[model samples]
Target chain A: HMLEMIKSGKARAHTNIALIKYWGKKDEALIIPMNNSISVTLEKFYTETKVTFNDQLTQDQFWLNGEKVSGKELEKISKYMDIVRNRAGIDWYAEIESDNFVPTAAGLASSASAYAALAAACNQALDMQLSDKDLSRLARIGSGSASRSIYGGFAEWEKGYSDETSYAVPLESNHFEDDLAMIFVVINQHSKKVPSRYGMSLTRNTSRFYQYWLDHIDEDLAEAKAAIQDKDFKRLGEVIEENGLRMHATNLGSTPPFTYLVQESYDVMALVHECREAGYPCYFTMDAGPNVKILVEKKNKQQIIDKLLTQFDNNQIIDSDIIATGIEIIE
Target chain B: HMLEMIKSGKARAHTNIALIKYWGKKDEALIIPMNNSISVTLEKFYTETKVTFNDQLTQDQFWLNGEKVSGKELEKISKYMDIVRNRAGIDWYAEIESDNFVPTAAGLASSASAYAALAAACNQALDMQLSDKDLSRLARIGSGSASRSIYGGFAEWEKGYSDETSYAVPLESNHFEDDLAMIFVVINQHSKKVPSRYGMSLTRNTSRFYQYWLDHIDEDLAEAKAAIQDKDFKRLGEVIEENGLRMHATNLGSTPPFTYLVQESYDVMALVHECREAGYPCYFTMDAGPNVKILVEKKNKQQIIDKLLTQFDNNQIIDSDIIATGIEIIE
Candidate 1:
């Protein structure tokens, strides 16, 4: 069965990342937003998590690459598995072996893609005919951002109060896969002392300036969605950059202020800006951590990367193509 | 003789807290605005420096109460005293002794009242018959806020480019002096580690949120001034509170965020709201520092204080009637 297919190596999966930020919670326990937020689902940056329900394993376990993982390391994957398991109506345990093509701790959208891939892989393992919608719902319960990864091209996670209401919606049915390419500028690939989740919460509560954020989210989200709908690259880039700047500004307002953009991050941002002034359609987005992902027209991606590479250390970057896969079984 | 006729020793001074904070000089020689700002002139809560500025002294020297003062502190005071010296056209050095009836370092308006009182006292010492307008200009050279103190009632400091144009304008002149009385709620009186001048420059150059302040100042100033003219207490209070909030909000947007309002500041703010609800025409304004000064109907001043004292500690409170005294000399 599912184990046999995995052993034969015929299945595949991909992850997703949200362009707009997911910040704050109205209901902490339920993971609801105090206000609505938006995110663009991206390609070329995800994980392929493969799972197999096996009698050989006594209990549920996980493997990242060839490494066996358990405890807190596996908690994120296990908690997410609970949702899929319940949806598939399964009783037996499963083993997950996932590998990220992109560096994990480098602050690209790996988590979004990882969770979505897991949802898809696990769905295939259970032989459940889950639609992208079902996979997105299942993935969202795992990581708030993962819901957007259920679709290719531009996807938005429409913020809502309850789990059922908040799920990813595809901005365009097209992948835009042929036109877009991404490059990761990994600055200080080290892990941060405080994850973005903790930092965002600190910014949410401590920044008196946060009051400004409450006023503009609706307009920003609406405009961004419209920009994506029109496939207007310049408009999309502007909104994405503005939304990210505001998010960073919120961090600066926290009581004990912090910023992911250090000298390395600054260099990446400045170069992207230089590229823009030079009439390149290249834009960049950052995850909770410091590494930045630059989006550019597929044709110009290499030229832009080569120009930027001259300014950065050679090994700190990796190139990838626009991925069309979403959160469903690849069989 | 000038001191005796300057009688009624009933001279009143208002302290000016620089709002569009003058932190650094972009054109240090020009004193230009890196950004524009607005500020409130507070009544009652000011230093009443009754200086005689004796012509007998061989050189310009200042005394606090009965004590002689000198050195770095003297350097600042000398810069201030020079303004009056130049304005009064006095040849001989003057002996200036001052007294601060109000709290000294409890984060209230000291220099605003100090410079204004110095200008007034020295004006009397020189037998220089100067209009309040002339005195306000002279006082501004000592400290930007000193100009606002020349008025007996409400004032607004307009951010102008040059020394000649940038000075306080009386929003409500002495004509309505008795209409308002203010009491200080000393929440934190510690000497500031970074004074407003330094804070202002830091905010201008670094705060991302400073743009919001720049965008809103004209509207707030115009609306608040009109509200004062119409004697609409509700509108006045609302606009004043909103402006103050925005001013402080910019400070938080500074390189390393700041909070002038501690828990006690919030406590006093809440109490002022409660007083307004009780139908008293009272509102509060804060300076660059943490003292909360509440404006109330003259008749209701003591009543409000009596009620406030029941909740706030005795040491944390002080009250004064709105003074109509402009500038006068003390024997």
Candidate 2:
């Protein structure tokens, strides 16, 4: 039986930061978003995941960041593995281990890389023979942002109507890939009480501005694409910054308004503008936390990093260049 | 000569909170806004001013909240007095004494009442005999929000092209005089470092979302007017809350982005939502400071105030209803 045939696979995936944010879900069960989003993969932050399916396994066991985890954590992994088992038609449970270089739930899109790597590892272990798009769809079933992390560099996730239609498409024609640098400013590393999923659902259900966001995201996506195509950093940065603000605005306009920005978050954003005024042409984007990600040109990388170091500790800043390294099976 | 004639006047003006906010200036010299706005006059917060113009004085003397003001403060009053002098055709200087019940520069619209009282006092002192519309135009020169404070109850400021037509008009047909209660959540009593004038100017000059605001403010104004006409407190409160957020969004999207909302400000907003979920039907609005003003039905005032007392001190929350007292001439 396939369950008696033991198999093991390992894969690595890089974390991504959304420029045009993925904020809401249209289909919560299928993990389909309400708007298209764009992201750039990072070379510095990533996750390596290994999956082993064997007849000797009594149940799905999981470990994260060098520590064994179970209960709710194991349940979560088990549920995800069920999808892989069903697709591969196997009753064998799996031992899944993941080591995350990016901090979890800290606005660095750690789950994007984590789930993408897991999806790739499971696909290889079970011989699912899934294409990149199929793997993206599979990863999305774990975390919506994981869909976009399936691709490297500039990637766009189309908010399609159904489970079969919604998937991320890599922007292969974009010419400014090597010219960009992203700096992650970690202001707070604490896990958030209100995760992005809960916050997004609350915003979608309660914010009056949610419809306005849905109405304008297409235009923003189109402009972002155009900017990427023309290698227009100014236009691209503006769109990215504004898109992040728009997403946060929805949160503020929610029934019980909330903000991801801590005081230090705004301080970092102001510093980014100071860099821009000083002629560095840097822009910033934030997700569901206080940390800020600055987008600067490769030429100004050291200058921007040096300036940030004056205010922030060296450990707070993670500087990386855009990389074309999507999820890959290593074993 | 008219300049030699000594005259004195006293007036009181209540603070007015914008339901549809005014941000950005089209004609800064004339204090003309890019879009129309609406406001509600409050009974609890006001400013009383006593002004005297005489040939005996060499310059304008200013007193605020019971202390003498000079230098830049004195210059600001002197410049405003010059406008009053230019219109009334007087060269004599004046002594101005003003006392604000509301916290000055604390996002409580102290200037709205302060300048409105000043304009009215000046008009009465100089024998200008300007109509209410003209009084609005005069007060707007001091501060844009001051225009709406010239009238009690609901008021609308028309964003006309030239100075001649841009002025606030009272919404006499509205029926929500005593039906509402506004609870001020004083998250921070400290004065703002970046004044509204400078912040608004920065937003106008650098925010990418400024045009979006200009595009939407008119619709917001119209809806606010309709909500008042219909005595739909829920609708009015929602529009008011959303408009304030939209205005703040501009500041957040501005170059070197800044926000008046501190951590406690968001805490208060969440408490307001809790009140709403508990069926209090409360909505909140904020200006250029960290305070939040919740608009609710007068019937539920005590219940809402009681709930707030659990988390906040009595001094932190001031509850008041709408009043029909605009700029009033006193002895």
Candidate 3:
């Protein structure tokens, strides 16, 4: 079916999410953050999107693993749909079927790889071989961070002034996918009361402590970039955990300031501390979401999965490694 | 007549407050913090005291500024009064004239100085010849930080345990009078919704970030103490600011966190940044309050005052050089 659609001058798209956070709005309308962020885009695990122009559907619908999601779900996906319509030159209402082969927000590298794939597929469907910058820009308009998800393997979104200027760039090709793997301890998929955007805004405005983050960020970015260059897992782990801590600090400053961290979050941190203290080379990183994802050498994956499952249920664990292909259409 | 009463051992007292901050209970019952704090004592301040054997007054009537305060106000002061009374071996009903010579709740150095003065006055009223340590102990019982004000001048309350251990010692005892002054910039003085005590509790109990502080504080405290030893204004300024920044960060990680800074606080920081860029030797410090107090050489006081008066009203500023006198009865 995808090949027939390709012959008809159309393609599908998907994208992923960056674990590094992108916070604050330098350009609100364009959905730009004040600083850049980095992530890993998975190869085999991805979201596929095929767009069809139609005059029939009432509004954008999100089919998550087959069930049609309404309310906030419809509202959330509609934003991405609108961006694609405007940028891809689709004026008519279009139907899009997006299915995630990867775990859907089960805390795998889904959004980063998923949205990137979506943008690429949609561009093909529209007969547009948009630049990665263009693709990143279009995706960013949907989710402030999803723009950075357009690349594979080691990718970073440099926060720039305009949408066209700000886009995700691959530091290294996922041609080296076997080197890194991300495992999520999927405790829950419940929605957060405070969204990332809302939490970031609160920290930007209210935190007396944010200055330290601003003061020390150069070290963070530099070390992170260096780690990617070196492919040094140890360095990358340190920087990723540090970045997450800094981002979470901002949330604490939010008005009626609440922490994204729960008791379980501490339990996870304590375990990581125990591991690190005991000389294990594993480290953890978190997004705006609650679950913790640990980065480990592929050789150590089973050992980690077993340990985590003992602490959590075996069903709650999921793994995602680097994906080589950025985005592709498959029937 | 009241002046004569202070002369005749009718003691008076005042409490001092912090514009920067001190947090954590190293020894909670001893009322010691993990870090030392700096404060400015106000000249126009509040005071109350207890006198012995006033059976006619019917059970220890407490007067605040010549007015008897009952219920909550009486309840709050009574506990500390009991502490002081039990320690001093006095069975007399205290005739108190507690008043604020300066404005109340104006973010001035009210709490520290007020408590310091009150402790000395009350002890002397009992014909107690108390050393600076002894006076500080009485004040510490009233509030953890009030002890820092007893010695006057630029003082530091070392985070120590027990009455014999905890007390405020002058940073540079010789600078106690006429050579260096601290000026308070009162912005918003209303009491905070979440008090520093609550914030400290949250940080101690919950914040993961506190470990970073615990790991790094030895370096900061060493540098700060050395800077104070050498009277290295620049080093002192830098280290003091860093320590405060780190301390505030713990609050940032607390659940249901709070910020002591108002917009005006940031505005003051901006001004300080601008002035420093222009090579002003002025160094500013804040405690738990929102106001800023700049420490400057005695000779620069007039010039600094003129500049400050240009932006803020003359009425809001409380100007004073370090006073050499330790705690003394009004007489």
Candidate 4:
């Protein structure tokens, strides 16, 4: 009974990259996206988190990458923890510590794994035993992208109308789990000046092209799903690459327009096209930062990496396979 | 009888840069654009051409910059001369000599002035008393953008439904003619690998956002007209710069996408933004090549040029004012 009174849990979760991106939000409070999005979980970068609910703790505390954080960061984690505590109807406060093997806020989607791991840890420590779907919704409350990371391999986040329906579902299949891989080119390790949330909000409020972008997401998602089902690499690459450019186009049309593409970003993109022209099967996608991720098959991964290594450094380029498992209880 | 048998005419026409770009075409043969575009004729670059129709000439011979050209180049000029011949009911061919003080096919819109000068020379030499609008229509056959160079200062090429109705009209107003100026950043002097015609066709056929781009051009044109009417330099700069960015965005969405923006282009663009942030009023526009042109007031032209001089070489930067005359009978 004493051991049960002081419960502790640890978990690990991998990061995911959106192939069909979730850009703008419909409801900022519930964290509902304006359009459906799909992502591929990465086997390379992830986060490990531990949560312990102790009665002796006066209030919730948070530590990230070995440094104790307070102010807004602590406040955000405390709010996320409250959701887990309220669900289990517990009076104790939690002490959460998180470590990420990836760079934070560097366009690498680090928040996806961070909140996903935290959600799993809190649920286990509090003995909530929430289902994966419910866990996705809970993780989404922390970060919108976190919802997709709750599933392994391919996952689709439905842009449902309300909180009850807007959660990610696993699109687990053998083809994607086996054949797919990604190579990340970390062009810049620094954080973005405009965060994804602010950037999306700015584009939504100001860009004339925003509605046109939203109108086409369903068609892209359908084609992407069909391409994956048939294991057609060419079609899959075309749809995802077009979708990403469409996403970036919206920001260019926004008032006081901005672009995430730096000089190196364009250079890397040009090289990616050179690879395709040279008879290599490769495609590229970029998020809110300068880093670009190359999507290719596992068989051509080394060849593609060899081509990229001619331009980028070894530390700047990293490869990862599509992950098959989600959050796990480590201890 | 002698004057009728042998006639000579010469003219000079200045170059123009498109503030509002023309990207796609509706009728390729007629050179009818999908939307209207605006341009500012420059005083810097011009073409001086002399045409002579003599009974002694067996065929249409052409000399450009003191070197004779034949094959496809001569064929194009012969075809253009045939239009004049068909109008005047004469069978005799012409000997054409042209000197271009500008880089051909280098995004400087040299062809705009080139064909404009040729059209003016042929109009007088062949005794075709065509109006300015008719000459503009004839020039459109040589090069679509050449139609705009038929007018001086600000010009708009109306996108009419049929060949007879589509032509450029001079926006001859006191505001644009008197005060506006431009600075050309010659980022690259070499010709483009993909010319404007091929680039526009590829984007029209492959880009998913092509229609969206077409749908928004009218709004941009309307805003630009209003800005010029009010002599609103700030508003004019904003509209033209956004239009240029939007034009580039379409190509990025094309299948096996391409961009003309080299590293130097971005560096110059960033410098333009810095000038804007530093309280110097200026705006930038680019064509199908990597060169950029900054549109500002004549009062701030030197100030802007001085700022750019810190980064780019003096030879790479040239300034021009908005000229009030299109083509002149110089000989």
Off by over 4 Å in 1: A1-15, A34-43, A55-58, A173-177, A189-193, A205-207, A253-258, A299-303, A306-310, A327-331, B1-165, B168-211, B214-331
Best lDDT goes to which candidate?
Answer: 2
lDDT of 1 by residue, A78-131 (tens): 666666667778655677777776566655556677777777777666767666
Error of 3 at A149 (Å): 3.3
Q: Model 4, DockQ value? A: 0.26
lDDT of 3 by residue, A116-159 (tens): 65566667667677888888787777666567566666778888
Per-residue accuracy of model 2 over B1-331 as CA lDDT, tens digit each: 6545778899999998887888889988889998888888999889999998888799899999878997897898898999889999988889899988987544466779988999999999888999999999999989889999998888999989888899999996455777887889887633344678889999998886677678778788888888888888888887888888878877777877788777677778878878988989888888888888888889998888898888888878887788876778997
lDDT at A325, model 1: 50
Interface RMSD to the true structure, each candidate: 10.6, 2.8, 10.3, 4.8
- Residue A192's lDDT within candidate 4 is 41
Error of 3 at B152 (Å): 1.4
On DockQ, the candidate that comes out on top is 2
Q: Which stretches of candidate 3 lie over 4 Å from their true place?
A: A1-147, A151-245, A248-331, B1-8, B11-21, B38-57, B176-178, B189-192, B299-317
Candidate 4, A15-123: lDDT as tens digits: 9999999899899888999999999988888999998889988899888899998899898888877788887798889888889987764457678999999989888
Give the per-residue lDDT digits (tens) of candidate 4, residues B287-308.
8888888998888888899999
Candidate 4 steric clashes: 0
lDDT of 4: 0.84
How well is each residue in B1-331 modelled by candidate 3, as lDDT tens digits?
4443332244444444442356777776668777666554444353544343343444555676577789976776666666767887865556555555546557443455456656776777766788777787778766777787675555677767666777777666345335556667888734353466666777777665777567666677677667656767777666666556566566545442345554455445556555666566566665565677776667777777777776778876776655554554665
Candidate 1 lDDT, B1-331, residue by residue in tens: 6554332222346665443333334444334444333444554466656544544556667777678988877777776666666666655555566777656666565767877887776666566777776677667666666777776556655556676666666665424546766678887533343577777777777775688777776776677667667766667666666556666666645544444554456567767767766777676666667677776767778778877887898888877665554444445
